[PDB]
Structures are given as structure tokens and as C-alpha cells.
Amino acid sequence: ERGYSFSLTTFSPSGKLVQIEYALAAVAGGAPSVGIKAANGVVLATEKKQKSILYDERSVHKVEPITKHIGLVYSGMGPDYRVLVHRARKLAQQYYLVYQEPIPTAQLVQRVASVMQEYTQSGGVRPFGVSLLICGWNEGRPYLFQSDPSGAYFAWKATAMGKNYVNGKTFLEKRYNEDLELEDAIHTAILTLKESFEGQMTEDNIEVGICNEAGFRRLTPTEVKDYLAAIA
Amino acid sequence: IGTGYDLSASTFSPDGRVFQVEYAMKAVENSSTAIGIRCKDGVVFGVEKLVLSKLYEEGSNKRLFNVDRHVGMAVAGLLADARSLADIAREEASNFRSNFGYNIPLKHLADRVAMYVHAYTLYSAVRPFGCSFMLGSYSVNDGAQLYMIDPSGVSYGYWGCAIGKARQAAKTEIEKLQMKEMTCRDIVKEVAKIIYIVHDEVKDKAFELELSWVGELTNGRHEIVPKDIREEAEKYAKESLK
Amino acid sequence: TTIMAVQFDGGVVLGADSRTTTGSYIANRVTDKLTPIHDRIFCCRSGSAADTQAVADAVTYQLGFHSIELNEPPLVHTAASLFKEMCYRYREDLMAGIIIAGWDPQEGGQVYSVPMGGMMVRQSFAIGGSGSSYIYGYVDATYREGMTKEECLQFTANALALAMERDGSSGGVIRLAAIAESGVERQVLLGDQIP
Amino acid sequence: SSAGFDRHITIFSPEGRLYQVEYAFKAINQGGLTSVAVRGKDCAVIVTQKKVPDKLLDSSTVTHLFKITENIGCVMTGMTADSRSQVQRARYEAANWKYKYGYEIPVDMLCKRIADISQVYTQNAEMRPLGCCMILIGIDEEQGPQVYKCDPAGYYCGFKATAAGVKQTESTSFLEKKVKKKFDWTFEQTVETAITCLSTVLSIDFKPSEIEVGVVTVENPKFRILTEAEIDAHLVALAER
Amino acid sequence: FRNQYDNDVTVWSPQGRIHQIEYAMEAVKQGSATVGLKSKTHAVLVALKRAQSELAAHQKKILHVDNHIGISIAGLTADARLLCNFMRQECLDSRFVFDRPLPVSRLVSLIGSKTQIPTQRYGRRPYGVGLLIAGYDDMGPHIFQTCPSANYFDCRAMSIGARSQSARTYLERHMSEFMECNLNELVKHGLRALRETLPAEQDLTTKNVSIGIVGKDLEFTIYDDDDVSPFLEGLEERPQ
Amino acid sequence: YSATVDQRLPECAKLAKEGRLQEVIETLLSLEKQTRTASDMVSTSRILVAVVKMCYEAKEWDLLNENIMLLSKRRSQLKQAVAKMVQQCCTYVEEITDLPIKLRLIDTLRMVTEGKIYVEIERARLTKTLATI
């Protein structure tokens, strides 16, 4: 089994590629991220806690927008996340140029899954060690998707990945209800983050973003602090 | 020792060091000894070339080149490596002159050649240029410049420095000489004596010293030592070695 | 157009008109034919404005790269070399003549002319553009040696004003720039300031 | 449990680890020097230990901190050849940015671009991932001074203060002890705090002639390299106080 | 195996060598010996042609490239032939563009540059052929010995190939006379050097030797069994 | 260095008999700064014992308080010299029998010691002096 956990172009005699599984394992080691599809929108949160308070928390962002109505968060590597952001933005605006219409989130997820799976085609290029959570609002329906390093993309009413993803998934199973509203979805997401935050989340310690019929936007530290106080 | 990591130039160590460049250092100190000194008004180079066989004609395997009219080129290491590196340096200088219409400053040429030699330190399909070379120049509006550039890819400025199997021995006695005032005329004797004391006679005998320089003494043109100055330097070295 | 540059002991003075037309209609009367290339190197453009602006941006990028690489302000000869190379490489499709003025500590004030087709040459006084064919006799009658700053200003003023009034492709206002060790001083002449 | 995986950069180890990147990070400390940057309200000061093997070495060419663009300064450590290649690449990127977009590069944008370059470098097996750590400093309008750090992994981050070198851990701890006091850090205070951190992390009480300093302020947007007089004045003023 | 450092030209030895380069250097030793001499006005290359079988002609070792420059091979037929073809093309282009014969120094430097690329870059094998270049230029005759390490030397004479040390010490012994010989004496000296390479039981017969001679007014012409015949009449007897 | 202090002590005491605290304290402080930069062994102890001695002789205390504050807040102080000067303070804190200046002196000796050092035990002695009070 060792001799086949070394290349991306060789099938293990029993199952499938082992480098893909190792990339997923790297994904599982990332900062926890939680996505929730509410009735009127979608909300994705992540933890930004890092030692050495010297770090400028506003300098980099784990949550970024792709277009006026689609955003994303990541779990796993950072630079790969930025590369995925660049590819998604370029591809979304290419679709916009061809069609003069805001990008359907499903198509963006499909095409970004294709571009990340492209890196898995041959050896010498490692697969992205990042899993994507894509939030969007299109045609009167909030869409939340997960994109894999393997290129697999699927839907999620509410999911949690990264570190401690299994317990967060269980928590989401317990708390999620299909009739959830946006603010209550944010409350549930922040509660999920707190369930494994380990160190008293602050306004900048967590980065959250919400998408609805008014597009997608990352919540400022002010509203994050307000919601944190509301949850307490 | 880094076994399992020194098989390529793009693999780091558990400690984090590329051993291809370190073996390049090893090859460099397993090569000839060349000493170049930047005088007050130019630079001079001198090369200790071993005559492996008396069948070899004198002037064979010339090691003191000139990359530009005002730019010299000394080198120690591998002769083929030396010639390839000199060719690439000449190409870079020619491109610079064609594109910019003037001479290339020695700091800029040193940086360009250092980046080029680094470009082979790090790829796996190629190997670092395991040779260390002297760049020297004199410009009436810039000054006199000299540079050690090694296979790793770092170019450093030296008033007068030597490389070879006796780097430490050369450094031991090159420091005692005050430099920043006198010129090539007073530095040729020091070069001759240092190369005649740094060469080993009991082992690895049968060497010859070849000298060259650039500066206003040749209107900023690099050219080999005239026979009279070279023989005077040899006589001074023979007298000084008692 | 009319672009005139000349060096003096301590620097260079260079002026130009401000007329850009597409046909007999004056497209813009407030054009700055002088585009600042470096902190102490200035350019004067003649011909098709698009080509001049494009080559100006390209040489600005190349010379900024070269300067930050040498950590020392570039020589005017170098710049003129880039202008020559760029103009020749596109002379079959470039309608752009460039007069490069500047000051460097290496020598002082330097002026290099590159007319149509790419003559990278050097001289004391350089006049270019469509208006260069009207003050040639006037400048040859009025040019001396040993200008000062004030004399340079008056020379630029009267020469460019004569080109202004005699040529229909030079109009608007006069732009003047003086480069020296102290720095670069830019002035605009409009109204009663012109002679 | 994971032995052969620490050979190729593009190879994922079990538990999703890339050992080559960590080895490059360790290779950064092969220089043995130390750098540290501190940002104030409107100032940013970088300070680097200078190591002179011989007076034979030309002190004007052995500098370990450079200037990317007229307002953006860079201080970095690691492999010296990697350092110089990285600064050349960064200067290319900044000049191309200015050419294509007509205005100066912000510190964060330059750091992000070079980080993307390094990530692409570490993603494909054709490259040795440039084992040198860089810190860029510069002034951006509406956001004051900015200090950013980029690493061979392609990870860039903004810092209220940062450090690098063999003594990175202790310097970062001292910088944390300094930043928890929440002080405005005027220019002189920034410089003296950085100097104190370097001295206490080296425990050498260095002479004035063994360090280099660069400073960028809003009133002095040009990345100034501190000559001997200014650094000597700063260090003696600190010493008496 | 502690010899994993000699499989490609892109790996340095632990003690700082490229053992592939040394292997290429040893490769040319398997070839037959060949000695090059140069007079004041003429240059001669004398090669021991070796035949696979006596039922067949001997292998040629004196390739002509230009009327002023001739070459002698020692080593791989493939590498030597590629080098010779590149020489012929380079001389052709040089005459086409400049109308002057190729300088020997520039030709040899171009050899060094061309064969260095296989030494440095992964892919093509290092050129494992020792070449003896007898050329004529402004400084008279020139003898160059280019080693498979992409290196070249300027030598008064040179013997490369099998058992070349005997001829090397022979030429070291006869150093004192070389510069003042005319064609006959230097040809005899080269023949004696080759005889020194050859063991006693074999002699330098008509089919065994190939000689190429170039000069100021005489083009580089290679002689054959009938053509070499006069040059072997002046040869003396083996001192046994 | 040691020559400077051994030739300065007589004249320094003679000037101290005039009181004139300013110039003597600035000169002694400058000498202390230069000898701390040079990292001298006996000069530091001589300077500190001298300044404490003159401060005791001139019947003012705030100057010695400021001296301890500046020496504590300044880096690069050799352990032996600091030990000697606190020993001299300890033999200069108990023999005084005036209530306010004694309580003030022990207060300063307590509060100048954030970051206790090897010579802590010596300060322990003067703590028992406070025990008496």
C-alpha cells in the first residue's frame, strides 16, 4: 500500500488515489469553517485565532467575495485558498463577460471544481490542500456548496469542515432546522464555532459572512461583536 | 550527511540545506587558486595555473578573461564551467550594451551573473555552476570594483581576495596589507609574493602565475600583464621567498 | 507641434506648445507634450499622440526598472538608447519623435534628439514637430552660447511664441521645464505672459 | 510512519504534511542573522544584524536589507542567493504593476503577489521554493504604515511587528511583551524598541557598526537607509536612557 | 550501494566531483592511440587505425573539416561523428558569412561551449570523445586536445588513446628538439611516439597508420595505404 | 578607568565638602554611563559607593533615590558592583535612628527591587530592620 501512496497517476490495487486522500487529510487539519443555508440566505463562519497578537487580523481574510452575490470560505492551506479565490473571480467574470448576467452559484461551483480537479490530473503538481465552501443567492434560492480537492462538489444544507469537523457536523445535525432564519443561522454558526473555539472568540477572532437577496458581504467586526454579545 | 537528499538540487535537508551547493563548494576548494585585488585605480587578477605536463604549451587553458572592455574575468573551479560562465557573462554584457548604449556597471553585471548561476543552483534538471569567479572593473565616473561570485549565487565585494585550496592560508596573510591607498604597481609585488608563498612546492608543484588588469593604466581596458612587469613580479617573489 | 530643448551650464531647459488636433479641429488646447519620465529626466513628444503616449509609458516602466535596479538615477544616454531601440523596433508603424532632456550628476545637463525613424543623436539645441520648420531660421538667428536660467526662459518664450503664431499646429499655452541639480521646475505661459 | 514523503515538494505526506516546505522554513535560519520590523502610528522601522567576515568585504555590498521601490523597502533573511533572486523578482513585479496600473504598489499587494509566486513555486515539482523570508514596509494612504511578511510557503501576513532569523522565537516573544502594553510608538520609540529587542535576543550589546536600519514614514515616504550617524544617535540615546 | 552519486552529470560527489565526467574521461582511453605534432609551418596528425577484423578496412581516425584545420578522434564513433558534422557545418557557415577560415581558438572555444551543455543539462550524454585539433592560424600551427570533460588544452604534441603514457613520456624526453624540426624529422618523431604506444609484436604498417597534414600553403590532406607509403619509408627500425 | 576614579576620589570628596550636588552628580553619572558601556568591574562599584557616600554625607536622600532609580532602570550593571553598593546601603540604612527618614529609606529599598537578584538576602537583613520598627 506504500508503493502506491506516492503518485497521482497510479491506482492502488484495492481502492483509489492515496494522494487525494492525503490532501483531504490536510484539509481536515485547517481552521474550522461552518456553512449554513438559511431559508432566506446563507451564512459562513470561520475562526481567525492566531498567536502573536502582532498579527494584523484585518490584513488577510478567510472569507472573500467572488462576485456581488457569491462568497467563499476555505479549510486547509492558505495560499491555495488565495489561488482558488483568484481563479474563481477570473472565471466568474469571464462568465459575466460572455453572458452579461450575474453568475449562477451552481455553475461557479462546477467550474471551480473542474479547475481544482485539473491539478489532480498528472504528477508533478500536487492537488490543492484546501476545501471550499461556496455561498450564493440566485433565482430566489440560497445555495451552499462544498468543493473538494478531488474536484468533487456537492450540496450542503449546513456543514462544518476543518479541524473538529465531525463534532461540528453532529452539532449541526442537532441544531439545524429547515425553517431557520438568517439571524438564527448566524447564531447557530457562531455557537458551532464556540463549541470548539478554545479561547473565547472575539470580534476579530472569528470572520463571518452572509449572503442573501442583497448580495453577499463579509460582516464587519462591529456586527460580529454585536452578534457575539447577543449569543454571549 | 544528507544521504537521500543530496541527489538533486531542488531537495532541502531535514536541517534545511541544499547539499548540491555544498558539494559545489567542495569542488571549488578542490580547484586552482586565483587571487584578485582591486587597486586604487582599477583591478588586477592573478591565476596559479598548474602545468600538469610540460607537453602543455604556455598560455593553455587561459583563466583570466575579459567579459567587457573595462571588465575583466578571473575564475577558479572547473575549466568547462569557467568557459560556459564566461560566455554567458559576455552575452549578458553585450545585451546590456546593445540595449542601453553604454558600459555595464560591475555591480549590475555581478548581480546578473549571480542570478544566472543561482538559476542552476536550484533546478533539478540542471546542476549549479561549481566555480567561483572574480569580476573586476574600473570606470572614471564609477570607481574600481571587484567581486567574488560563487556557485551558490551571492556576489560580494572584496578589495583583494583569493580562492582555491588555500583560502584560509591566503586570508591569513592578505589582511596584513593596507590597501585603500596604493595602486596596481605596488600591489603586483604583493600578489606575486602571496602566490609564491601560498603555492605548495613539496606537493602539487609545477605552477605558473598569469596576471592581468583593467584600469586607467590601460585607459580602462582589460589586458594581460606585460612580460616585463610579470618577470619583475616573479623576480620579487623569488627574492622574497628566501 | 513644437518641442525645443537646450542645455546650459547647470542643467537643461525644455519647452513645448499645447496643440493637439484631429483634422482642422483643435482636439485639446491644454496638452502637456512634456511627460515626466524620471525625477530629473523629461520627455518631449511629437507626432501621433497615441504612439507617443504608449512609448512614453513603456520607457517610463523600463527606466523605472533600470533605476531601481541600479539604485542610482539613470543616465540620459541610457534613456535615449531605449527611445532609439523602441522607435526603430516600431518605426514601420510608429509615428512618434522624442526629445529627451535631463540632468545627471555624471556630466550635467544632456539633451538627445530622436526624430522620425529613430535618429538617436545629441546636440545643443533640438527643435522638433510640425512647427520645427518655421522657427529654424529664427532660432539660427537668435541662438547664442552661455545661457542663464533667465536667458533660457526668454529664448524658449520668444522661439516657441514665434512657432505658435506662425504655425497652425501649435497653439493653446506654452509649457516649460528646467532640470538642474536643485530639481525640476515646471511653468505654464498663457495670456500676456507669452510675447 | 511517513519517511519517503520528505523528498518531493509536490508530494503529500500522511496527515497532509508537506515536509519540503518546512525544510525550506528551516533553511531560512541557515543565514544565522536576525531581522525585526516594528510599525508605529505613521512610521515603520526595519533593523537587521550585520555580519562582516572581514574588513576585506565591502560593507556597501554586504547589505542584508534592500529597497524594492522608491517608497517600498524590503528586509529579508535566509539563503543570500535566494534573497537576491527574490528581491529581483519583487522589483520586477512592482515595476510591472506600476506599468499595467499606473500607480504605486501597496505593501500588502506586493506581498500577496510574491506569495502567489511562491505558492505556484511550491505547488509544482519543477522549483526549489526560494527559501528566504522577506518583510516589506511602506506607507499607504488611508491606512498609514504597513509591515508585511512573506515566507516560502506563500503565506503573507500584515504585522503590528514581526521578526525573522535564528532568534525569531525569542524576538517574537519580546515583541509580544512590548505590544501588549498598547503604546503609540513614535518613530524614536519604534527604533529603540526594535534595537532593544535585537540586543536582548543577541545579548551582545552590539557596537554601532554591526547593524543596518531602514525607516519609512508618512513625512519621509522614501525608504531611507539609516546611515551611521542616525543609528549611532539612536543607540546612544537609548543607552543613556 | 555507496556509489549512487554516479548515474547522471547533474549530481555532485560528496567530495565535490562529477563521477560521470571522470567516467567519460576514462571512456576515450579504450580508443586507439593517436599523436599530434606541429612544425614551424606544418601540422601532422598520426593515428593508429584499428580494424575490427583483418578481413575489413581499418577504422578511420583522421577526419578533415577545413583546408586549414584537421581533427583526430579517440572514443565514441557517434559522439565524434556528431562533433565532426557540427564542425563541417560551422566551417561552412563561417566561410559563407565571413570568407575567412575559422580561427582555431574560436573553433575550440565553440567546441567547449557545445560539449559543455550535455555536461550541465539533463538529457544528452556528455561528449565522450577526445579530439586532437591540428589547425593553422596567424600564430602558425596550433595543437589542441579537447577532453570529454568539455575542457581543452593547448599542447606542443599530444597522444590520446590506448597506452598513451608511453608516447607522453617520449615527447617529454624529446621536448628539446621539437621546435626546430622540419617535416621529415617531426613525422618520424610522431611515428616513433606511436611506436612507443604500440607493443613490440605489432609494427606500424601501411594499413595500420593514417596521417593528416595541414599547413600554410598545403591543405589538410589525409593519406592512405598507398599515400602513406612514402612517409613510412623514412621510418627507422624498432629499438628492440 | 580605575586610574581615573582613584585620582578623582580625593578631589571629588573635596568638592563634595562644598555640597554643589549638580555638577558632581552629572559628572559621576556620565562616568557611570561610560564605564557601563565599557563594562568595567571595579569602576562601577567605586562610582556607586562614592555617590551613596556623598549623598549620605550631605544629609539629603532624594538624590540617592534618583540614583537607585536610574541604575535600576538602566541596563548593563555588573552583579558584583550592584551587590557591593546594596551592601553599603544596608550598612547605611540600619544605623540611622530617625523615624521618618528611616521608614522612607526602607520603603525605597523595598520598592527598588522589582526583579530580585542574588544579593536579595542582603536586603533581607534590612527587612528585619523594618521588623524592629
From Swiss-Prot, chain C:
EC number(s) on file: 3.4.25.1
Location relative to the cell: Cytoplasm; Nucleus
Main localisation: cytoplasm
Catalytic activity entry: Cleavage of peptide bonds with very broad specificity
GO biological process: proteasome-mediated ubiquitin-dependent protein catabolic process
Keywords: Acetylation, Cytoplasm, Host-virus interaction, Hydrolase, Nucleus, Phosphoprotein, Protease, Proteasome, Threonine protease, Zymogen
UniProt entry tagged with the keyword Disulfide bond: no
Gene Ontology molecular function, alphabetical: cadherin binding; endopeptidase activity; threonine-type endopeptidase activity
Domain of life: Eukaryota
Any one GO CC term of the record: proteasome core complex
Coiled-coil blocks: none
Description of what induces expression: Down-regulated by IFNG/IFN-gamma (at protein level). Up-regulated in anaplastic thyroid cancer cell lines.
Catalytic residues (UniProt): T1 (nucleophile)
Record-listed Phosphothreonine modification sites: T35
Enzyme class: hydrolase
Function: Component of the 20S core proteasome complex involved in the proteolytic degradation of most intracellular proteins. This complex plays numerous essential roles within the cell by associating with different regulatory particles. Associated with two 19S regulatory particles, forms the 26S proteasome and thus participates in the ATP-dependent degradation of ubiquitinated proteins.
Similarity comment text for this entry: Belongs to the peptidase T1B family.
Protein name in UniProt: Proteasome subunit beta type-6
Provenance organism: Homo sapiens (Human)
From Swiss-Prot, chain D:
Post-translational modification Phosphotyrosine, affected residues: Y155
Entry keyword annotation includes Cytoplasm: yes
SUPFAM superfamilies named in the record: N-terminal nucleophile aminohydrolases (Ntn hydrolases)
Glycan attachment sites: S1
GO cellular component, one term: nucleoplasm
Source species, domain of life: Eukaryota
A GO biological-process term: positive regulation of canonical NF-kappaB signal transduction
List of residues that carry Phosphoserine: S13, S59, S60
GO molecular function: endopeptidase activity; NF-kappaB binding; purine ribonucleoside triphosphate binding; RNA binding
Subcellular location: Cytoplasm; Nucleus
Keywords recorded for this protein, A-Z: Acetylation, Cytoplasm, Glycoprotein, Nucleus, Phosphoprotein, Proteasome
Quaternary assembly: The 26S proteasome consists of a 20S proteasome core and two 19S regulatory subunits. The 20S proteasome core is a barrel-shaped complex made of 28 subunits that are arranged in four stacked rings. The two outer rings are each formed by seven alpha subunits, and the two inner rings are formed by seven beta subunits. The proteolytic activity is exerted by three beta-subunits PSMB5, PSMB6 and PSMB7. Interacts with ALKBH4.
UniProt family annotation: Belongs to the peptidase T1A family.
Protein's recorded name: Proteasome subunit alpha type-6
Gene: PSMA6
Swiss-Prot record, chain E:
Primary location: cytoplasm
Gene3D superfamilies registered for this protein in UniProt: Glutamine Phosphoribosylpyrophosphate, subunit 1, domain 1
Pfam assignment, any one: Proteasome
Modified positions (Phosphoserine) in chain numbering: S109, S176
Numbered residues of crosslink Glycyl lysine isopeptide (Lys-Gly) (interchain with G-Cter in ubiquitin): K114, K207
Keyword Amino-acid biosynthesis: no
Record-level GO BP terms: immune system process; negative regulation of inflammatory response to antigenic stimulus; proteasome-mediated ubiquitin-dependent protein catabolic process
Similarity section: Belongs to the peptidase T1A family.
Known role: Component of the 20S core proteasome complex involved in the proteolytic degradation of most intracellular proteins. This complex plays numerous essential roles within the cell by associating with different regulatory particles. Associated with two 19S regulatory particles, forms the 26S proteasome and thus participates in the ATP-dependent degradation of ubiquitinated proteins.
Subunit relationships: The 26S proteasome consists of a 20S proteasome core and two 19S regulatory subunits. The 20S proteasome core is a barrel-shaped complex made of 28 subunits that are arranged in four stacked rings. The two outer rings are each formed by seven alpha subunits, and the two inner rings are formed by seven beta subunits. The proteolytic activity is exerted by three beta-subunits PSMB5, PSMB6 and PSMB7. Interacts with NOTCH3. Interacts with ZFAND1.
Protein name as it appears in the record: Proteasome subunit alpha type-1
Annotated source species: Homo sapiens (Human)
Curated annotation (Swiss-Prot), chain F:
Glycyl lysine isopeptide (Lys-Gly) (interchain with G-Cter in SUMO2) crosslink, residue number(s): K73
Cross-link Glycyl lysine isopeptide (Lys-Gly) (interchain with G-Cter in SUMO1) mapped to chain: K73
GO biological process: proteasome-mediated ubiquitin-dependent protein catabolic process
GO CC annotation: cytoplasm; cytosol; extracellular exosome; extracellular region; ficolin-1-rich granule lumen; membrane; nucleoplasm; proteasome accessory complex
Record field: transmembrane: none
Keywords: Acetylation, Intellectual disability, Isopeptide bond, Proteasome, Ubl conjugation
Family indicated by similarity: Belongs to the proteasome subunit p55 family.
Disease linkage: Stankiewicz-Isidor syndrome: A neurodevelopmental disorder characterized by delayed psychomotor development, intellectual disability, behavioral disorders, mild dysmorphism, ophthalmologic anomalies, feeding difficulties, deafness, and variable congenital malformations of the cardiac and/or urogenital systems.
Function: Component of the 26S proteasome, a multiprotein complex involved in the ATP-dependent degradation of ubiquitinated proteins. This complex plays a key role in the maintenance of protein homeostasis by removing misfolded or damaged proteins, which could impair cellular functions, and by removing proteins whose functions are no longer required. Therefore, the proteasome participates in numerous cellular processes, including cell cycle progression, apoptosis, or DNA damage repair.
Name of the protein this chain belongs to: 26S proteasome non-ATPase regulatory subunit 12
Source organism (scientific name): Homo sapiens (Human)
Name of the gene encoding the protein in the UniProt record: PSMD12
Shown stretch of the complete protein: 20 to 152 of 456
